Write a protein that binds this ligand. Structure first.
Ligand SMILES: *C(=O)[C@@H](CC)[C@@H](CNS(=O)(=O)c1ccc([N+](=O)[O-])cc1)C(=O)O
Ligand SMILES: [Ca+2]
Length: 240
């Protein structure tokens, strides 16, 4: 997250760190959202490489023991059947991870609330991105979880020629684009939390930023629209 602030320890309890085995240590690669005690929602592009993955729930500082973490392996990976790694712009950037063990819920570990199917946010709706991604374009990952206020940019504006044009689809949510605040590499897969009827709900799964850089004016961060995939999510969870 570029232009973020350190989140409080118990603000976003559905946020997880998706990590891969490197030698005899582990490395953060993406975020995700805990949606069931044994299921995580993330981006499909986060699992394109054939690596060994684990999920960390209750995490705040990647480089130190926080005394609240639970570490669990990934037992099954279900990517949307229409996903294509060579066309992130086609959409379908979503995947569900079945955990090897069900995690224990507490004030640091909670399920994310998802929107009702078909819900679209009005332009400029209040949302926050969270993650341990780069803190600057071509920078380094954050040690502590970061948050940034990123208001939505509706489809008509986002798909206009000076913004993302045809690259953005109605199956996606755009947010930010002020040139200062944005998601960045390593935030992919995590949540976009938006305030609706007094409750924060996870409306986006972080998907991409410009090739020019993370925080680029009129290139808002782009997310998979969770409310377009509610039937798919329920269908996968019910048949596994
Ligand atoms: C996500 O972090 C976005 C920017 C918000 C970028 C792509 N994702 S990534 O750099 O985290 C990533 C993770 C894992 C894989 N993989 O397993 O192939 C690939 C990329 C971005 O748009 O550059
Ligand atoms: Ca830690």
């Amino acid at each position: 997250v570029v232009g973020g602030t350190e989140a409080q320890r118990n603000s976003w309890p559905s946020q997880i760190s998706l990590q891969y085995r490197s030698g005899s240590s582990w490395a953060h690669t993406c975020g995700g959202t805990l949606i069931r005690q044994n299921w995580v929602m993330t981006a499909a592009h986060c699992v394109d490489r054939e690596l060994t993955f684990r999920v960390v729930v209750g995490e705040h500082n990647l480089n130190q023991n926080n005394g609240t973490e639970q570490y669990v392996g990934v037992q099954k990976i279900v990517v949307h059947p229409y996903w294509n790694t060579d066309d992130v712009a086609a959409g379908y950037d979503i995947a569900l991870l079945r955990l090897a063990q069900s995690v224990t819920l507490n004030s640091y570990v909670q399920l994310g609330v998802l929107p009702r199917a078909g819900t679209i946010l009005a332009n400029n709706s209040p949302c926050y991105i969270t993650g341990w991604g780069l803190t600057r374009t071509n920078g380094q990952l954050a040690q502590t979880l970061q948050q940034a206020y990123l208001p939505t940019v509706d489809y008509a504006i986002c798909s206009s020629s000076s913004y993302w044009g045809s690259t953005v689809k109605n199956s996606m949510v755009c947010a930010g684009g002020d040139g200062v605040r944005s998601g960045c590499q390593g935030d992919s897969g995590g949540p976009l939390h938006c305030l609706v009827n007094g409750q924060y709900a996870v409306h986006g799964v972080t998907s991409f930023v410009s090739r020019l850089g993370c925080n680029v004016t009129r290139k808002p961060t782009v997310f998979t629209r969770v409310s377009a995939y509610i039937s798919w999510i329920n269908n996968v969870i019910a048949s596994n």
